[PDB]
Amino acid sequence: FQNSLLAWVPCIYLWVALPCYLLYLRHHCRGYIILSHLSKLKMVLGVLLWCVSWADLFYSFHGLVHGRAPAPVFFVTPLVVGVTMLLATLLIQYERLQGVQSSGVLIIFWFLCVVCAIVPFRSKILLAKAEGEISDPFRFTTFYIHFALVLSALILACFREKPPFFSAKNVDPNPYPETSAGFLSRLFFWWFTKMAIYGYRHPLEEKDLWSLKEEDRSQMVVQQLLEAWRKQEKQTAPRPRKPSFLKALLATFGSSFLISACFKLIQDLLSFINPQLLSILIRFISNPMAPSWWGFLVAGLMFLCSMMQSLILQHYYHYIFVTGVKFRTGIMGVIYRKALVITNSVKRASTVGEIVNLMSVDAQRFMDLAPFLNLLWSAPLQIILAIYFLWQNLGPSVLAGVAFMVLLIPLNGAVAVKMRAFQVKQMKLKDSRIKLMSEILNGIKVLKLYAWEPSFLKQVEGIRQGELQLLRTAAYLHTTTTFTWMCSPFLVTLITLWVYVYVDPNNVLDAEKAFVSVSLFNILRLPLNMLPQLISNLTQASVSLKRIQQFLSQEELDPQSVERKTISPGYAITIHSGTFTWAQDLPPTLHSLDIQVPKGALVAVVGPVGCGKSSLVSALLGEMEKLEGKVHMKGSVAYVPQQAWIQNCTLQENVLFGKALNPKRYQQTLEACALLADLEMLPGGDQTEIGEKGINLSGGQRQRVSLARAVYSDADIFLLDDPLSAVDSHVAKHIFDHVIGPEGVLAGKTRVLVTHGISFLPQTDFIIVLADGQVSEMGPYPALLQRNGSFANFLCNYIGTVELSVFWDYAKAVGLCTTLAICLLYVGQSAAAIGANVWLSAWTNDAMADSRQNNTSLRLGVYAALGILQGFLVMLAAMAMAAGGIQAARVLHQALLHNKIRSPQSFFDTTPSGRILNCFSKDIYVVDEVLAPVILMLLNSFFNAISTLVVIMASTPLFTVVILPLAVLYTLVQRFYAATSRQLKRLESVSRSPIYSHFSETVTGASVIRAYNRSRDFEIISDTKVDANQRSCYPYIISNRWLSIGVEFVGNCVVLFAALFAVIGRSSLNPGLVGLSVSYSLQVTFALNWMIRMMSDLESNIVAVERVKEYSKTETEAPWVVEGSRPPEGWPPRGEVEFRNYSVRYRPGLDLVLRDLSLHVHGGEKVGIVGRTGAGKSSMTLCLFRILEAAKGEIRIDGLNVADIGLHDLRSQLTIIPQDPILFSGTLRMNLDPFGSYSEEDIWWALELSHLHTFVSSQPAGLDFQCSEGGENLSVGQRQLVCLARALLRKSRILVLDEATAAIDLETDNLIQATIRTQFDTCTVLTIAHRLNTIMDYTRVLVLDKGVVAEFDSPANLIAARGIFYGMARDAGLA
């Protein structure tokens, strides 16, 4: 304060200039100054002046070493200049979105900046240069740079701004509240409040999100990127390398990535202020003479400079996540414009699944790279400028310090890539298990209709046990991610202290280096343990951008192949010298073809299969490339692919397909195609969802849908490529009569047809034959009838939060003896760490007057033995918790499965089995291995934060009052976030998939999308469907920030109230305890924002356990073993069946199926049940095996009831032929005997009796032959022969046949009936009536009427009585 004390003229000015002036920017609202690059320069030069105002500040702090404490006004005024011009930069950025033609105050700002500088300048311009050479070199260079930059600021402020052209108040949806938001309210992210309130008192549905801001509508961002890629042309203005996606991607985000480097720089280069004020405070309290206001100022400025660096960081993640989302959109939308205009040979070259995999992967790989990408230059600058401080403050003993972190990184990458093969590439066991789960789910019926369930229980338990034995070795080595985060700080401190002590004996320890080091390492190791993730994402994203660049350099034949301007009059379809080839390396399918077609007539193309008929239509659409020839298409086009294309939406727009709904015309098209017959089946009618979403409409129906689309779209030329392949003749003829032919609606259309039919030919106006891709004849049908030349060839040829109870339940799964040995053991480890630190504190203070310094050889020792325990009593937690997790997964899966098979048939009847299949796939993988590490890290961060909040308390025992707000505010903000972020996570996960589902539907229908020139009006459906994703992924990004302003505010009030309370009790403390209490208070604002990044992430994964508890306790009601009351065995041979008024229904509350049925059956009595087909005799078959339980009456077999026996002993003594013979996927060994209890000779003998011995003998392995999924690789007759072989093996004395003639071939049905007559002559046989011809043979027959018996009699006598049996026998034409 000698001559430059006046430098405070500008600063305080702002603190009165800002508020009063700011109101002028609020009374007038919009303004919207346009951004000229002069504004960008005005911004960035402020940042440069800021960095020099940092350089002089750390030159002032350099005085800390070499002897003196800094002079009073040296470490205050540069740091107020460097916050005032930060405010200047922020105000520039804010008026960038305002409307001031000129400031009127910032002008005075710069004027006074020059005024307060020239007078000091005039006093040293000649008083320091001619006197010598030194002239306070750094302090003078600072003035020189400041002078140059302020002169630039003045000359840039001499300008004037353009007229506001402010705005027009267009619409009032929910606007994205960054526009129309005060500067002070867009700094603390406070404008999000008005939604976080509504995210906790209400549910959120899509209509209540932000209406996305006008900059990004997914088509003003893909426009820029696509144009930049266009700038990568051949560049008319070396090695062929012209394609360069990276250059064009970089050249369109400079204004959003170099604005996001003037924040990370300011932040990290600013965060090194706290580890210097800490040394200042420690040095202060060590001196009991300095006035207390010095300490108060240092504390109150520590808080400010540790908050304003926490507000130019949590205001940087916003700008570096919005850019990630902009990547994820700009690529998802430029991958699309190419996917619409590919050449179908390229589509042949790959699979549509991987064309999708260019999204959800390789394009979602970005936005997972943007947060880390900026770290490339931060990692050195946050190291080489943080190694300097330690090497300046602990001597060259920090070599080992950072060396341990550097060594850790490869040893944290190796045992993270070992999992990339030992934990994901060994999960083919999971795929086999889920395929087996789908195998035993689809077909559970037949498996339950008789025995063999426990065999499959064991056969899935084997793979479960194997894969869990694997995981025992796959989570044990997942305890190297807790080792880092809760042993690297302590261990590196131990190593560096040990080396520093034992390098020389005359460099004694003291607080102002040990504690500043232990607090500066904390700053060092956040942007150093997130380095392995960077080095992995760079690899797995450079592998991705390579593939994206590859897929974007392909072939497009759109520009011109079939011109549409000049057409010969009187002709509509004309080709001259038409040569068409599918691929340049393929033979030419069509050779110099010359086809001319008139206007409005009918033309068809005939010939052998694939001789050019399935290629001409492709060539006409311009899809197929041409070597020579001229084609002239006139007007609109319609095209019906052989493989119908159906959009995953409602049928009405699947037929409307983007045109105005004409009602009468729409129903005319619907009725002409005769879709009404199918339409009546649809529940929602024309508004029913269609496609992958729901019912798999038959190709014979989807072809009708596509034809209706074509005819409604009333184009002028129709192309038909075998549109009646699965459409039956009786309906196809009417389709042609009402639509295609001149008698149809399309009389005045230039229709073209590709056919394999015959009766369609005679009424055709014009026929062209084709063969070998070369035309051979042409003309009207009679011209080809009499010739019988080329035509003869084909003439002959053809939501609330989870309740706490669930958590306890999970603990019960882990085992209380373990889950009570973890929380206790973490308490132990926290005690060990807090003891180690409070021991280091008592080590530091000893050096003040220690007259026996040899004691320093002891403390260090016990330090190791006080933290190695903590470095070993957390491994005993992580290993034990991994073991508990795998054990809990084992027990939970065992219970879920072991209970689900036993569930009654009704459950699988009502449940859409695929939902059961999502479990064993997703809702148990989550429980298995993405919930135990989450437990580890949650329960680990919690005990890392309790250690801090207890150590600060124990060090400075007086700030107990302040912890009450520091808890109530924290829990309040955590509750609000846990509501809103969870809601948004759900609402974004819901809408993520429909993007990918809308893709994989346009690549396949690439050709169908064209030929209606609807491609252009089809991106506007793609981009709106990613806009509906973005508007639920922006607020998530600005809801994970508004938390970290209500957290990194508490985590800094705890720094203010640690330092200030240390100062207020200076006389009662020592430097060691204060260094401890401040060094860990500075560290808590990270270990307390890391305890919400997971305590609100586990809340979205514990739900899995919830589901695995809802899919249980489902009334097994199937006691298989009642051994105390076994029936006497060996009662097939008696073979007596006796119903006694047995009354049964499907479910309690459902209709009554059977009504007091009674019967009298003896051994060998072949009996069939007759009645009305569809009455539910299958229900009676199910009752025989107790699939449905009676409410009255019972079934007595040989004097033995069915309700007093275990289910398996019951079902084992019977024999069934299921109506659908299923074939378990795999060998024939288990498909005949999963238990393998029947010898090879018996099985071969029975297969000989099965009359499939020839086919299996022809097979190489015979019984070891592999069966495809659902037994698809064997013929139908083979399936029935397999099921009857299954029946033959067991060979009981009771048979009950079940409708083996649903849609089963008769040629093998004769064999089945003959066999079951032959070998089953000594067994009681039931039979369900699907045919009256073959039931005229059994000795006796049951007559049944939906639950009431009529008689037991022979068919010869039943027709004589002239009853229902006779009526139905006569209705079949047999009497």
Ligand X SMILES: C[C@]12CC[C@@H]3c4ccc(O)cc4CC[C@H]3[C@@H]1CC[C@@H]2O[C@@H]1O[C@H](C(=O)O)[C@@H](O)[C@H](O)[C@H]1O
Query: Which residues does the annotation place in the binding site?
Result: 607-614, 1171-1178
Give, to the nearest 10 degrees, the angle between helix 1306-1319 and helix 1240-1250: 120
Q: Does 943 bind ligand X (CB under 6 A)?
A: no
Question: Which one, of 313, 303, 302, lies nearest residue 378 by Cα?
Answer: 313
Q: Which of 532, 607, 933, 1127 binds ligand X (CB under 6 A)?
A: 933
Task: Provide the minimum distance between the beta carbon of 534 and ligand X in the complex, in angstroms, as a whole number.
Answer: 8
**CB-closest chain residue to ligand X:** 1040
* Sequence-distant (≥ 6) Cβ neighbours of residue 1208 within 8 angstroms: 451, 1120, 1121
Sketch the per residue contact string, 977 through 1016, with ligand X: x for CB under 6 A, - otherwise.
----------------------------------------
d(C-alpha 496, C-alpha 394), whole Å: 9
Q: Does 375 bind ligand X (CB under 6 A)?
A: yes
Residue whose CB is less far from ligand X, 1040 or 1083: 1040
Residues placed in the known binding site for ATP: 607-614, 1171-1178
Q: Which two tokens stand for residue 1118?
A: 């199937």
Residue whose CB is less far from ligand X, 6 or 417: 417
Residue whose CB is less far from ligand X, 995 or 1311: 995
Using the structure block, give the residue that is written with the tokens 């006779």.
Answer: 1366
Residue whose CB is less far from ligand X, 731 or 879: 879
Residue whose CB is less far from ligand X, 746 or 1038: 1038
Question: Which one, of 539, 512, 53, 27, lies nearest residue 283 by Cα?
Answer: 512
Q: What is the DSSP string of 36-84?
A: -HHHHHHHHHHHHHHHHHHHHHHHHHHTTTTT-PPPGGGSSHHHHHHHH
d(C-alpha 309, C-alpha 617), whole Å: 66
Q: Which two tokens stand for residue 1011?
A: 């030929």
Of 21-29, 797-805, 888-896, 1033-1041, the segment contacting ligand X by CB under 6 A is 1033-1041
Question: CA of 573: how far to CAs of 166, 634, 768, in Å?
Answer: 56, 7, 13
Per CB under 6 A, which of residues 477..536 are in contact with ligand X?
481, 527, 530
Task: Provide the minimum distance between the beta carbon of 216 and ligand X in the complex, in angstroms, as a whole number.
Answer: 16
Per CB under 6 A, which of residues 716..775 are in contact with ligand X?
none
Q: Which of 50, 483, 1034, 1036 binds ligand X (CB under 6 A)?
A: 1036
Task: Provide the minimum distance between the beta carbon of 929 and ligand X in the complex, in angstroms, as a whole number.
Answer: 9
Q: Does 1029 bind ligand X (CB under 6 A)?
A: no
Residue whose CB is less far from ligand X, 309 or 1040: 1040
Phi and psi torsions of 1050, nearest 5°: -65, -45
Task: Provide the minimum distance between the beta carbon of 33 and ligand X in the complex, in angstroms, as a whole number.
Answer: 29
Residue whose CB is less far from ligand X, 472 or 1093: 1093
Task: Provide the minimum distance between the beta carbon of 1090 and ligand X in the complex, in angstroms, as a whole number.
Answer: 4
Question: CA of 258: how far to CAs of 95, 373, 538, 849, 1111, in Å?
Answer: 20, 12, 20, 53, 52
1320 HSE (CA, 13 A, CB side): 33
Q: Does 1089 bind ligand X (CB under 6 A)?
A: yes
Q: Does 189 bind ligand X (CB under 6 A)?
A: no
Question: Which one, of 156, 146, 181, lies nearest residue 102 by Cα?
Answer: 156
Q: Does 1253 bind ligand X (CB under 6 A)?
A: no
Question: Which one, of 144, 109, 301, lies nearest residue 293 by Cα?
Answer: 301
Sketch the per residue contact string, 947 through 976, with ligand X: x for CB under 6 A, - otherwise.
------------------------------
Task: Provide the minimum distance between the beta carbon of 102 and ligand X in the complex, in angstroms, as a whole number.
Answer: 38
Task: Provide the minimum distance between the beta carbon of 371 and ligand X in the complex, in angstroms, as a whole number.
Answer: 4
Residue whose CB is less far from ligand X, 177 or 527: 527
Task: Provide the minimum distance between the beta carbon of 321 and ligand X in the complex, in angstroms, as a whole number.
Answer: 5
* Sequence-distant (≥ 6) Cβ neighbours of residue 1067 within 8 angstroms: 288
d(C-alpha 362, C-alpha 544), whole Å: 5
Of 220-228, 351-359, 959-967, 1088-1096, the segment contacting ligand X by CB under 6 A is 1088-1096
Of 216-224, 659-667, 1034-1042, 1338-1346, the segment contacting ligand X by CB under 6 A is 1034-1042
Q: What angle do CA 1314, 1316, 1317 make, to 5 degrees?
A: 60
d(C-alpha 712, C-alpha 662), whole Å: 10
Question: Which one, of 76, 50, 105, lies nearest residue 302 by Cα?
Answer: 76
Residue whose CB is less far from ligand X, 382 or 1077: 382
Residue whose CB is less far from ligand X, 933 or 1046: 933
Task: Provide the minimum distance between the beta carbon of 521 and ligand X in the complex, in angstroms, as a whole number.
Answer: 15
Using the structure block, give the residue that is written with the tokens 């017959």.
Answer: 677
Q: Does 1090 bind ligand X (CB under 6 A)?
A: yes
The whole-angstrom distance between residue 1125's C-alpha and the CA centroid of its chain comes to 53
* Sequence-distant (≥ 6) Cβ neighbours of residue 1339 within 8 angstroms: 1165, 1166, 1167, 1354
Per CB under 6 A, which of residues 1093..1112 are in contact with ligand X?
1093
Task: Provide the minimum distance between the beta carbon of 362 and ligand X in the complex, in angstroms, as a whole number.
Answer: 17
Residue whose CB is less far from ligand X, 903 or 1096: 1096
Q: Which two tokens stand for residue 1330?
A: 């699907």
Residue whose CB is less far from ligand X, 313 or 511: 313
Q: Does 413 bind ligand X (CB under 6 A)?
A: no
Q: Which of 143, 245, 317, 1224 binds ligand X (CB under 6 A)?
A: 317
Strands 1152-1157 and 1137-1145: antiparallel
Residue whose CB is less far from ligand X, 41 or 930: 930
Task: Provide the minimum distance between the beta carbon of 907 and ligand X in the complex, in angstroms, as a whole number.
Answer: 35
Q: Does 1037 bind ligand X (CB under 6 A)?
A: yes
Q: Which of 300, 371, 598, 1065 binds ligand X (CB under 6 A)?
A: 371
H/E element holding 294? Answer: helix 292-307
Question: Using the 8-state DSSP alphabet, how is residue 1260 labeled?
Answer: S
Of 172-180, 191-199, 798-806, 1035-1043, the segment contacting ligand X by CB under 6 A is 1035-1043
d(C-alpha 597, C-alpha 206), whole Å: 53
Of 28-36, 114-122, 420-428, 1089-1097, the segment contacting ligand X by CB under 6 A is 1089-1097
d(C-alpha 668, C-alpha 664), whole Å: 6
Q: How many chain residues interact with ligand X (CB under 6 A)?
A: 15
Of 184-192, 843-851, 892-900, 1086-1094, the segment contacting ligand X by CB under 6 A is 1086-1094
Strands 717-721 and 638-640: parallel
Task: Provide the minimum distance between the beta carbon of 949 and ligand X in the complex, in angstroms, as a whole number.
Answer: 17
The answer to whether residues 1047 and 1085 touch, using CB atoms and an 8 Å cutoff, is yes
Q: Does 321 bind ligand X (CB under 6 A)?
A: yes
Question: CA of 670: how far to CAs of 677, 685, 709, 736, 1353, in Å?
Answer: 10, 12, 9, 14, 52
Task: Provide the minimum distance between the beta carbon of 1040 and ligand X in the complex, in angstroms, as a whole number.
Answer: 3
Q: Which two tokens stand for residue 1207?
A: 């289910």
The answer to whether residues 810 and 1102 touch, using CB atoms and an 8 Å cutoff, is yes
Q: What angle do CA 506, 510, 511 make, to 5 degrees?
A: 165
d(C-alpha 1061, C-alpha 123), whole Å: 43
Task: Provide the minimum distance between the beta carbon of 527 and ligand X in the complex, in angstroms, as a whole number.
Answer: 5
Residue whose CB is less far from ligand X, 764 or 1040: 1040
d(C-alpha 276, C-alpha 70), whole Å: 12
Q: Which of 1002, 1040, 1079, 1085 binds ligand X (CB under 6 A)?
A: 1040
d(C-alpha 1371, C-alpha 1375), whole Å: 7
Residue whose CB is less far from ligand X, 250 or 530: 530
Using the structure block, give the residue that is written with the tokens 């009497």.
Answer: 1375
Task: Provide the minimum distance between the beta carbon of 877 and ligand X in the complex, in angstroms, as a whole number.
Answer: 16
Footprint on this chain of ligand X (rule: CB under 6 A):
317, 321, 371, 375, 481, 527, 530, 933, 937, 1036-1037, 1040, 1089-1090, 1093
